[PDB]
Ligand SMILES: NC(=O)C1=CN([C@@H]2O[C@H](COP(=O)(O)OP(=O)(O)OC[C@H]3O[C@@H](n4cnc5c(N)ncnc54)[C@H](OP(=O)(O)O)[C@@H]3O)[C@@H](O)[C@H]2O)C=CC1
């Protein structure tokens with residue numbers, strides 16, 4: 001039972017504590033550690049942090065070197081977020097969070113525990129096929145070693161990127177941001193299981209006096225103006241799927257789409273508030289969308305789409321899968337546990353405390369309308385992922 | 391559930407029968423239809439048939455033009471050290487899709503094929519262990535249905551059908567004999583097993599209706615016993631590279647089966663030209679079982695270090711390893727999908743067959759199954775190292 005190994009992992013080592021660590025900095029941030037800079041959200045996080053702060057962003061990246069900066073640079077460039085002015089703000093740090101001490105020597109880790117003022121832990125292995133064991137190192141031990149730095153030499157505030165996937169599916173009443181964490185058993189998939197464990201670890205460090213914010217994004221999607229978006233995204237995969245065979249599923253679940261520019265603005269905004277310490281926030285769209293509505297938006301852009309019950313739609317996918325290898329790659333994702341006629345289940349959240357904490361900021365989630373979809377679709381079209389609607 | 395789809399599908403359409411078709415050739419074969427000439431066994435089949443008959447081999451191949459299909463065929467055999475340019479005039483490439491009605495031919499092309507072809511070796515099939523039954527319904531079931539339609543169109547054509555030992559129930563007290571009929575659908579795991587089960591049900595119905603058919607159930611088919619030739623996309627090649635790469639292997643209960651392709655090829659051709667074979671079913675599997683630890687000993691002997699762990703613990707370390715390793719992750723997907731009974735301590739179950747009826751049929755042919763030993767495994771690994779699939783040892 002995987003649950004037996006999760007519980008054991010959710011225990012934080014006794015020596016991960018404030019102990020005799022010097023107090024957190026009270027002035028402005030001078031140096032920040034960000035993980036996941038070569039990823040989707042990390043890119044907009046990195047760029048947002050350069051804009052809203054004057055701190056040097058230390059970016060932990062997997063690479064063979066000065067090769068880290070190029071990975072970072074390329075990543076931001078793929079989203080239209082890079083300028084040369086960013087280069088001096090960014091300090092790549094060669095590492096691997098799936099290793100002890102983030103893959104640094106004892107000597108390098110000690111130096112880091114002295115230079116870093118605050119931590120934005122965004123890095124994680126996101127994979128919807130792999131079992132728990134696959135993501136144990138990066139997600140569980142990665143977070144454990146983050147807490148180890150956060151408490152080493154001098155206290156460092158931790159802004160932790162978690163997911164709403166830590167909450168049980170198949171629930172009518174949205175989940176409030178203050179409700180405590182449930183059993184490990186209520187969870188499906190190795191990713192959710194790993195993030196569940198990680199958040200347990202973080203909550204333990206918080207209860208032990210480390211200054212921590214917990215941010216649970218929902219389904220994060222493209223930048224609402226430029227439409228910049230990760231095409232390796234399952235949502236993106238699924239979109240091409242339906243397009244290319246001209247049929248979409250009916251699902252009774254309410255759909256959440258949170259543009260990444262909101263999510264990243266929100267993270268920075270909430271991280272800058274002393275009131276956020278100890279708090280959890282659901283960074284999801286305040287406004288939910290229905291299945292058929294997104295289909296309407298997509299027809300309007302020009303793509304034809306027959307609408308089928310989810311079940312009958314997976315069947316057609318199965319058949320088509322024997323045709324395309326990309327369509328098959330998507331079939332593997334959808335062929336697990338949620339396959340019935342009303343679609344897959346998915347969590348529903350309240351974002352009350354978030355909307356409240358952000359009411360005084362210029363940070364508002366974009367609304368999901370036909371205009372946003374067109375921004376997204378046009379982007380995928382112009383970038384070659386999709387063929388232009390006839 | 392899918393067994394209900396399976397059962398509906400195992401029903402051979404009414405019109406697929408003998409009726410007014412001219413009887414089968416009784417003279418020498420003039421033309422042969424071979425499916426799957428771009429695949430592994432088909433390459434060896436094609437070479438056996440070319441060597442052992444004087445017929446022209448019509449190879450149904452997926453391509454944009456005929457000359458591309460010929461190039462596809464050509465390249466395949468060469469990858470196995472099977473090609474020879476004397477074979478070119480022997481081969482008649484045939485553009486089509488066995489997952490399409492009439493194999494992807496027009497009514498006119500289909501009628502003309504139904505006039506030319508004297509016998510059918512149906513070896514083409516979608517072999518995929520991740521996809522569901524619905525993904526392989528087209529090639530395996532309706533593909534087989536359409537071949538049976540060809541075999542009964544205009545004039546009768548004997549069919550030699552490559553099935554698989556995987557249509558057989560797993561975990562049974564006795565090695566399944568070639569004589570026992572098919573069990574129900576419910577006890578087959580995986581879309582692949584399920585589509586082949588359906589396909590064999592179809593072929594047996596046609597048989598019952600009087601179509602001359604041979605049913606040939608290969609076991610796990612492996613590299614050529616002398617050259618060591620083998621297709622790397624193979625799940626057994628896949629698995630072996632894994633264990634090598636991560637320096638550990640699982641200890642399993644199951645008796646393993648290894649059948650070199652050159653024995654399968656030859657036995658299929660052999661049995662097919664025996665008139666005693668019609669209506670009969672044969673199990674082309676290695677008569678001698680090998681054990682897990684035996685196999686690990688042969689590869690250590692070749693030079694590869696291998697720790698031995700229990701399947702579940704080996705499977706767990708595979709999980710850990712797949713974090714950074716796409717191809718490791720890829721392999722992990724195959725094994726995680728197997729039902730709990732075959733993901734346990736002793737590892738995956740696997741079927742055990744008898745090949746008595748095959749031995750007698752292949753009394754004196756010079757055709758027998760090579761043995762599994764360090765020597766065979768050395769031939770196998772040298773090839774893969776040479777092909778560059780494997781890094782050499784030490
Ligand atoms: N809709 C969404 O995408 C959601 C995201 N989140 C969370 O946001 C965070 C970012 O997700 P997202 O941007 O979408 O995913 P990405 O896969 O695009 O980015 C993952 C980042 O994590 C890095 N990473 C993974 N493993 C390691 C490792 N062992 N060592 C160092 N770096 C590593 C990756 O570096 P590398 O390039 O080397 O792989 C990459 O930069 C994650 O924690 C995710 O769980 C939460 C809810 C929803």
Ligand SMILES: NC(=O)C1=CN([C@@H]2O[C@H](COP(=O)(O)OP(=O)(O)OC[C@H]3O[C@@H](n4cnc5c(N)ncnc54)[C@H](OP(=O)(O)O)[C@@H]3O)[C@@H](O)[C@H]2O)C=CC1
Pocket residue numbers: 425426427428429430431432450451452486487488489512513514515516517529552553554555586607608609610611612621
């Ligand atoms: N260990 C083994 O290999 C065993 C194999 N078998 C059976 O042997 C036969 C072939 O096995 P194997 O050689 O290993 O597999 P391969 O995948 O190597 O060969 C598959 C062959 O089938 C062709 N094929 C698949 N789909 C189509 C299609 N829609 N139209 C035309 N051709 C198609 C392929 O052509 P293309 O290249 O264009 O895809 C290819 O020529 C199968 O019937 C299999 O069930 C049975 C037991 C064991």
